[PDB]
Amino acid sequence: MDVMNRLILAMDLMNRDDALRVTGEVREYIDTVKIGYPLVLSEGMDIIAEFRKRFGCRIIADFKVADIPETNEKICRATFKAGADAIIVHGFPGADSVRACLNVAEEMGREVFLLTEMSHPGAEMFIQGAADEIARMGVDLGVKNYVGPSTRPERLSRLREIIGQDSFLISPGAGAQGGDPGETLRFADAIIVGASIYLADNPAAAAAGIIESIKDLL
Template structure:
C-alpha cells in the first residue's frame, strides 16, 4: 500500500458532517484515511462507503478485530463489503483468529494490518511482552502489513527487524501522544495522525507543518 505524503489521517470525529468538512479541507494532501469506531458507531458503515466514494481515497478500518475466528470473519466480511481497503486486526487473540481475517481479505482482494503493539502507555502492561511474538506470527502466516508504535522507537525498530524491509508498517502516536514524524519514518512506511490535525484551528496548516517536518 502506497501512502501519499506518508501520512494517514485518523478520522476519529463524532459525526459524518465533521468528517466531510475536514476532508473537504485536507483531501488534496492525502490518499489514505483511518476510520475507527467513533465515526462508524455514530453513523454506521455507510460512513466508510460515503467517504471512499466522495474522495476516491483508501480507507483502513481501525476495528482492532479481536474475537473468535467465526466472528472475526463476519466482521471483516461486512467491513470489506462496505468498501474498506484494509482492516486492522489484533494479534493477541491467536493465529486462527488472525487467519480468519486474512481469509476474508483474500476473498475480497483487500488487506489486513496486524496490530503488534499499541502506542499508549498502558500497552506496556500486557501487549509489550508479546508484541514481538505477534510480529513473528504475522510473518509465519504471510502477513505483510503491520501496526507499530511511534511512541517507542526502540520497539518499532525491533518490529521492523522481525517483519523485514519489504513489509509495510504504519505507526500511530505521532503528535499529541508524543511521537515524532521524521524519527518514526526511519522504521515505518507511514504515520497515523489524528488529533494534531482534526483538533487544530487550522487543519491544513497543521498537516502542512507535518509534511514539512518530514521533508526537512
C-alpha cells in the same frame, strides 16, 4: 501500498458533517484515511462507502478486530462489503483469529494490518511482552502489513527487524501522544495522525506543517 506523503489521517471526529468537512480540507495532502469505531458507531458503516466514493481515497477500517475466528470472519465480511481497502486486526487473540481475517481479505482483494504493539502506556502491561512473538506469528501467517507505536521507536526498530524491509509498517502515536513524525519514519513507512490535524484551528495548515517537517523523507 503507496501512501501519499507518508501520512494517514485518523478521522476520529464523531459527527458526519465535521468529519466530511475536515477530511475535505486535508484531501490535497492525504490519500489514505483511517476510519474507526468513533465515527462508524456514531454515523454507521455507510460512512466508509461514502468517504471512498466522495474522496476517491483508500480507507483503512480501524476495527482492532479481536474476537474468535467465526466472529472475526463476520466482521471482516461486513467491513469489506462497505468498501474498506483494509482492516486492522489485533494479534493477541492468536493465529486462528488472524487467519480468519486473512482468509476474508484474500477472498475480497483487501489487506489485513496486524496490530503488534500499541502506543499507550497500558501497552506495557501485557502487549509489549507478547509483541515480538505476535510479529513472528504474523510473518509465519504471511501478513505483510503491520502497526506499531510511534511513541516507542526502539520497539519500531525491533518490529522492523522481525518483519523485514519488504513488509509495510504504519505507526500511530505521532503528535498528540508524543511521538515524532521524522523519527518514526526512520522505521515506519507511514505515520497515522489524528487529533493534531482534526482538532487544529486550521487542519490543512496542520497537515502541511507536518509534511514540511518530514519533507526530506518523502
